[PDB]
Structures are given as C-alpha cells and as structure tokens.
Design an enzyme around this catalytic site. Sequence first.
Site, PDB file in Angstrom:
ATOM      1  N   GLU A 166       0.823  -1.205   0.000  1.00 37.06           N
ATOM      2  CA  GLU A 166       0.000   0.000   0.000  1.00 37.06           C
ATOM      3  C   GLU A 166       0.859   1.257   0.000  1.00 37.06           C
ATOM      4  OE1 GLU A 166      -3.166  -0.304  -0.518  1.00 37.06           O
ATOM      5  OE2 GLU A 166      -3.061  -2.486  -0.363  1.00 37.06           O
ATOM      6  N   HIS A 179     -15.841 -10.304 -11.127  1.00 35.29           N
ATOM      7  CA  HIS A 179     -15.506  -9.339 -12.168  1.00 35.29           C
ATOM      8  C   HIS A 179     -16.406  -9.476 -13.390  1.00 35.29           C
ATOM      9  CE1 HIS A 179     -12.000  -9.512  -9.568  1.00 35.29           C
ATOM     10  NE2 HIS A 179     -11.600  -8.358 -10.070  1.00 35.29           N
TER      11      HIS A 179
HETATM   12 ZN   LIG Z   1      -2.475  -2.555  -3.920  1.00 40.43          ZN
END
Ligand SMILES: [Zn+2]
Lengths: 597, 194
Positions: free
Chosen positions: A357, A487
């Site tokens: 992140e 998805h």
């Molecule tokens: Zn990521």
Amino acid sequence: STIEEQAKTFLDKFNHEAEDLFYQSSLASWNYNTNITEENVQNMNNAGDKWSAFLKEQSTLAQMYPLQEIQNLTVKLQLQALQQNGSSVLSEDKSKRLNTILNTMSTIYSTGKVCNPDNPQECLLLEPGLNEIMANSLDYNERLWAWESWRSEVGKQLRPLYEEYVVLKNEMARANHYEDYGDYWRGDYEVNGVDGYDYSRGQLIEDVEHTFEEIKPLYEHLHAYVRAKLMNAYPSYISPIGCLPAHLLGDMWGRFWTNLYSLTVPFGQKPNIDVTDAMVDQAWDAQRIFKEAEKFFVSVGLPNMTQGFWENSMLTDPGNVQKAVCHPTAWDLGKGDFRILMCTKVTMDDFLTAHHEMGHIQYDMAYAAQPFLLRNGANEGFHEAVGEIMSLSAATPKHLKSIGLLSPDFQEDNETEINFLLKQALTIVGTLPFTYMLEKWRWMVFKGEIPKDQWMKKWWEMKREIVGVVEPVPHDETYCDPASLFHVSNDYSFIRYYTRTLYQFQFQEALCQAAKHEGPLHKCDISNSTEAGQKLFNMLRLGKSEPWTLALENVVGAKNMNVRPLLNYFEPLFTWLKDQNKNSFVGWSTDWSPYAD
Amino acid sequence: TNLCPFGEVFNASKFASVYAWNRKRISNCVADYSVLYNSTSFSTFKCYGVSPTKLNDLCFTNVYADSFVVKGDEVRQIAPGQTGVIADYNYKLPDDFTGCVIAWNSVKQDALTGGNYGYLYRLFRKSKLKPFERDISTEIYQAGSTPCNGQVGLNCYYPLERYGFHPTTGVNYQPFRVVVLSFELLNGPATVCG
Ligand SMILES: [Zn+2]
Ligand SMILES: *[C@@H]1O[C@H](CO)[C@@H](O)[C@H](O)[C@H]1NC(C)=O
Ligand SMILES: *[C@@H]1O[C@H](CO)[C@@H](O)[C@H](O)[C@H]1NC(C)=O
Ligand SMILES: *[C@@H]1O[C@H](CO)[C@@H](O)[C@H](O)[C@H]1NC(C)=O
Ligand SMILES: *[C@@H]1O[C@H](CO)[C@@H](O)[C@H](O)[C@H]1NC(C)=O
Ligand SMILES: *[C@@H]1O[C@H](CO)[C@@H](O)[C@H](O)[C@H]1NC(C)=O
C-alpha cells in the site's frame, strides 16, 4: 483565437474546478469509510452525485472540441479522456434498462442464497461460507456440492441478464465508433499519434497470446506437479494424465492456487519463513511497521511520507465503539492529501501488505505534478505492479535480516528457496492461464465469434485446452459460469491482472539489474539502491502523460510486454520441477472428464 | 520616532486575496527589521541587492508592504523573472525588485473543516500584467470569438475562481500568508528607518 487555445483554457477551468469537487467527494467518502453511520453514507452519496453531474456536464461541454484539430499531445489526451462520456450516447430507456440489468446482476451475485437440501432454514452465504469451504475443506463430495450449488444458484439466474447485458454493451460500444465492448476495454492500451510508440488494440491480443505461448512450458510443469500432489491427496478422483477438477483448485473458481500450498509443499518438514514472533517479542505495532516501510522507501531515494499521512491515516482498528471497513486501501484524496486506510495486525502478511500500500502511495505522490486528468497510472496495470515489486523486495530474507527480524545465523538453503518459489508460483503463475482464458472468452463473446447457444460449451473447452481444468458436472446452455465470478458479473476488466503480473516482473528484473544484484532474481533486494530508485521514479513521475510504451521503456529499456523476466525469476523452481517430473507425464488431454466414466 | 504599524500588517486578522492584494503605504516611523528576521515563524525570507540584517542601518523615501494569501506551491511565483498564474495574472514583480517576500504557513487561521472557499484568484486574462499593477475587474473572459453579453456560456466563464482551503490538504495546497515589501528611492528625504 484558434481552437487549441480555447481547448487549453477550458481544460484549465475544468481541472481547477474538478480538483476541489473531487477533493470534497473523496473527503466525504473517507469520513464514511472510517466512521460507518447513516448521515455519513448520505454525505458520501450526495458528494458522489455532485461529482458525477459535474463530470457529465463537463463532458457535454468538452464534446464541442474536435480532436482532429488539436496538435498538443497532452491537451489531446486530456480532451480524449474528458470527451468519453460513456452510456449517455445510447437512448434514455436503453440506458435505464442497462443500469437496472447491472444492478440486478450485482445484487444477485452479492446476495446469493444457496442452501443444502437437508435443512432450508440454515445455510451459508458466499463470503463466510462457500469461500472457506472451497479454501480449507478437503472432502471431494463437499467441494463438488459447494461448486455445483453456487453455479446452479448464480449463473442459472444470471444467464438471461448477462445475454441482455452483452447485447446492450455491444450497442453502446458500436454507438461509440468501437467494434465491440472488448475493443472498448482494449482501448485502454491504445496509443495513437506518437511515432515509434504506437500501439493498436488488436496488438494487445497479439502480444498477450505470444506471451502466454512463451509461458506455456512453466505452467505445464507446475500443473503436472500440482496434479501429482493432488492425486496423492485425492486417491481416486484425479487422473494421472488428465486435467484437474475445477473444485479442487483452492477457491470457488480456481483463480489462485495459493490454497494448495499445504497439499503441494516440496519439503513439509522445513519451516517456512515467518517473522511474526520476532515482531511480537520486540513490541512491534502498526506505527513501527509503517515506519520501517517508509525507511525502506527512502533508502532507494524516494521521498518519505508527508506529515498529513501520519496525522490522518487510519493504521489501527479504531476500537469497537465505531465500525469501519477493514480493507487496505491507498487513498489519493487530491490536493496533496495522501492517506492509508488499513486495519493492521502484528503479522508478516500485514507487513508486506503495508509495504504494498505504501508503494501505491509512493506512485500516487510521484505524478502529483501532472494535470488532473493525467493523474493515474500509465495504463490499468501499473499501480499493482509497483506495489507487488515493493512487496517482493521487502519479503526477501536479506531485508528481514537487515531490519533485525531474522537471526544473523539463519542458514537459508535450497529447500526453503524451493518452497518459497513454489508458493510464489501458486499465487502468481497459477492465475495467468485462468486470466488469459477468461479474457479471451469474454472478448470472443463480445465480438460475436461465440453464438449464445455455444457459450458454456466454448467456455469449458477453452478452459480444458488452456488452463487444463475440467468441470466435474456437465453444464447445459442455461448456466452462465463466467458470471459466477465477481468481475464478470460486476462489469470489470480482467486483463489488467495478466498485464500487471508481467509488468511487475519486468520492473523487478530492471530494478535489480540497476542494483547490481548478483545471483538469482528471487533473492533480490532493491534496498539502499538509489540508482534503482531513480530509474523507477523516472517512470513513476510521468503518470499517463506519455504512452505506456514509453513509460515501460523508461524502466525496462524495452517498449513491449515480455515474459523473459518472469521466466528468469522462476528458473530455479523451473529446473526443480523439471528434475522432479521426469518420472511423470507432463501435459493434459482435453477429453477426460470426471462425469464421463 | 514611532514604531511602524507592522502589527496591523502581519498580526492582522484576515489577509486580502491575491487578485486584490492589500497595498499599504508606510512612512514616518521607526521599524526594526531584526525582530522580523529573528521571528523564525516564516518559511521564506529571501531578497537580493541588500541583506536584511545589513539593511537595518539604511532607509529610503517610502516603503510599500504588499500582503495576500496563496497556495503552498504558489509562493515560488513571488520572485522577479517568474511565470505562473500568480506572477502573470495575479501579482507581478519587476526584475529590478528592491524589497523581499515574507511568507508563512497559515493553516490554523485560513483553513476550516469543510472548506474555506472565501479566497479568490484570477485565472484568465487577455494579457499578462505589468509589474506593480492591480486588476480587480469582474468582466467575463471571452475564450472564443463570439460575444456572450456578460453571461457565462460556451467559451465564456467568470475569470475569478476561489481557493478551496482545508485543514488537511498537503503543504503544496495549504494557505500561505505572503507579505511583500518594497523599498523605493526618490529625490525626497528618508523618513522611515531604525
Ligand atoms: Zn495494492
Ligand atoms: C462518527 O459520526 C457520528 C455521527 O455520524 C459522530 O457522532 C461521531 O463523533 C463520529 N466519530 C468520529 C470518530 O468522528
Ligand atoms: C502542450 O501545452 C503545454 C502547456 O499546457 C506545454 O508546456 C507543452 O510544451 C505543449 N506541448 C506541445 C507538444 O504542444
Ligand atoms: C521526512 O523527510 C524530511 C526531509 O528532511 C524530514 O524533515 C522529516 O523529518 C522526515 N520525516 C520523518 C518522519 O522522519
Ligand atoms: C541499508 O543501509 C543502512 C545504512 O547503512 C543499513 O543500516 C541497512 O542495514 C542497509 N540495508 C540493506 C538491506 O542493505
Ligand atoms: C501576532 O501573533 C503572532 C502569533 O501569536 C505573534 O508571533 C506576533 O508577534 C503577533 N504580532 C505582533 C506585532 O506581536
């Protein structure tokens, strides 16, 4: 007095307005995400409506400037990104019909109520149920029941909705001068008007097929090894020379093979590396984890995190009194406000996820100088690659010995290396054929090369031919097994994962060659290599202002996608699998099935 | 022998916008610039031609003090020979600049939770401004060629946008209260110096 001057002034006005509007929208969304109430959802939805209405009005005002009379490449890119309105080209009734279709499909997927025929009152949902069932359980009948029941409960209902969805999407795409909806998605990798860096939309399919044809041998050896280990784990339910049943792949669909690590471990007696206990002993918390991540990122020369990050980010679970979503995200709220929302435990997996992140956040901070419409990755598959390379570089035993989480007398050997490489292949190489086959089927159904009375037939035979996975129960034309994935049923592009898996290893190889790393690529650490940090920032700071081909050349020196770095990464495991599978048949016959005995 | 009104200039409650920067003529007083130097509460203090600590034993005819508010990454436009929406359309300085710039972070005062949308700045102009000239017009900017009759429409938009100041925005978007001094020399006597 010309047209380009008016376009530039309009883009300036739009940027300066949309920046504040999007900042307010993302701020309200953040206030919701860290503090779940009803008024917070109201404010988030209101800000979202404001932002969407502004975007639609600005697209309406922007459609008045033709692209053919604009010379500047950046102005042309911004005008093209702002002119693509989307569904407003179709009629109003068809637009509302398509929106209702999408909402219905999403709702049926999210609230799927499948229950066993033994007691209708109690039964398991998808998330806390079917997922854990397909991931941890081992009974063949149980996994088969879960798989077949979820399929017959979701796809059987989504089939006509998905048909109408396909028709409406093809209509919308053909109204937008595209060939089909698959072409509309491939338009992400399209580059035009740049001599020497052009990229058509079918060239994407060509390069994808070529890269997969080059990957085929390693995946075949991995599949042979996994089939042998699963035949050891399932004595009479897997053929030694056939395909693998679809429900024995570790999850509901077989996207990742990570859940087969215990069943397919090379050396089960050797302990896999884990630094959770060393963190517990040395009083490690979220702040220390993120400080070490920031130090790793500043060692390569990238700038450290801002003060607003440490002041505004939610790094720990905010107790019990207030509920918040605990999905790790990298927040680019705009106006130089970068935050991370993550509930971090004292774990090595959470350590690597924090590194991932923070890599996302570094990439966001890089191109903050670009115009508003150009503040994103080069293409759809760059952010996750930038994150995964940082995860790989921080997960190596060298870095774990450097930060003091590992004993300096740790004797790393070939057994632990092979175990780690096999787990990496299960979580990386195992998803490439699945992704490629799924996107190929979706492109071919959007194109029209698959009539609606051949959907499941072509889908299953393509899976048998490419992924080497066979279904345990024959499915008629009423199923919509593709839509059983998140998805496919929520209108998301899937090729970004394939492209990202290739780009991350290209980046890793280039960054390690720039770091003067000697030895295998899987043992590489880009820490303290400022040359590599500069080589990476040279691309990170671009954004999408240049063609993604040029951005890729700025790091790996090559303009095109390639699988050579991935193969060079997995060479040790490749030779190990070649030495192991010499007494076993490699490959699969697309005819054998568990339902035809 | 009076202290120059620097209190109602720096310590003032609210500073004007950059497109309507306050212009105050200070004279007939005694100003010690050493306390301003040693305040150490400002992030930018730069001028050329005369050192600030050496300028204390010098004075001229009249001094002008310009004050306004801009973003964080827009204080770099307050310098001779610069180019930007602030240096061209909002506040221009000549190459022969004789004073200097005092800027500091002011998030505690000019940023409110929810957005302080009260600070304005001119975005477009038919021609770049000359050094030391003010433009506080409100006419609509004509980007195209057709007249829009003072109404906003196609290629017509109000050329005065607002700064959205929030307490959480990054330093490159935080409000920076900027003070600009000017030391001019004429044929008259010198009245303001320590
Ligand atoms: Zn990521
Ligand atoms: C969360 O929101 C509620 C009202 O929606 C408010 O009373 C509370 O103070 C908020 N909590 C935090 C930590 O901001
Ligand atoms: C495009 O316009 C920008 C200013 O908005 C300018 O800096 C750049 O050089 C221009 N490029 C071309 C190719 O015209
Ligand atoms: C980040 O780098 C700046 C640059 O010198 C430094 O002043 C700041 O203290 C650093 N942040 C931390 C948390 O050390
Ligand atoms: C990086 O350099 C620092 C400073 O010399 C050192 O403390 C650290 O152990 C090094 N780490 C690696 C992985 O080289
Ligand atoms: C105005 O307030 C600031 C902050 O408290 C202080 O440093 C400054 O000295 C004040 N102005 C004067 C003229 O004292």
